[PDB]
C-alpha cells in the first residue's frame, strides 16, 4: 500500500495528491486475484502520462482509465467518497 500526503485543492473541492494515481476496485472483486494484480502491474506506467497531461494543462480535472476487469485508475489521487466497510453504506460503483 501507499500512504499519500493529500494537500487540499481548488478545482477539486477535496484533498488531492498529484504524486500518484488512485485505484478503485469494486467491493465484490477481490484484489489479489491474478487478473487484478496483472492489471495494477502494467497500468503503473499510466501515471507518467497522467502527470504530463496535467503538467501541460493545469486546468484539467479527473483523468481515468476504466478497465474491463473492473478497475478504475484515476488521477489525481483522492480518497473515495464511500468505503464499503468503513461506515455502513456499501459503495456500488463499477466502471463497466
Amino acid at each position: 500500500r501507499i500512504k499519500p500526503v493529500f494537500i487540499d485543492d481548488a478545482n477539486f473541492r477535496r484533498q488531492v495528491s498529484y504524486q500518484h494515481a488512485a485505484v478503485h476496485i469494486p467491493t465484490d472483486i477481490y484484489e489479489g486475484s491474478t487478473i487484478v494484480l496483472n492489471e495494477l502491474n502494467w497500468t503503473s506506467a499510466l501515471d507518467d502520462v497522467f502527470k504530463k497531461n496535467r503538467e501541460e494543462d493545469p486546468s484539467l480535472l479527473w483523468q481515468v482509465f476504466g478497465s474491463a476487469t473492473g478497475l478504475a485508475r484515476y488521477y489525481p489521487a483522492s480518497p473515495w467518497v464511500d468505503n464499503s466497510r468503513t461506515p455502513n453504506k456499501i459503495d456500488l460503483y463499477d466502471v463497466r
Binding site: 455502513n88 453504506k89 456499501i90 456500488l92
Partner: protein, 48 residues
C-alpha cells in the same frame, strides 16, 4: 441545476425499510431537453 431529473410521482413504502441496509442511489444523467427548460412556442421548436 445540479439535481437529478425526476420521473413520475415519488412514493415509497415506509413499513418495509430496514434501518441499516444501504439503499442504492442513482446512475442517470441530467438530460433536460431544450423545450423543457423554457416556455415553448412554435418558433422555438423550429429554432431547435
Amino acid at each position: 441545476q445540479p439535481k437529478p431529473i425526476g420521473v413520475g410521482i415519488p412514493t415509497i413504502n415506509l413499513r418495509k425499510r430496514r434501518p441499516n441496509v444501504q439503499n442504492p442511489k442513482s446512475q442517470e444523467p441530467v438530460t433536460l431537453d431544450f423545450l423543457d427548460a423554457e416556455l415553448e412556442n412554435d418558433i422555438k421548436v423550429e429554432i431547435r
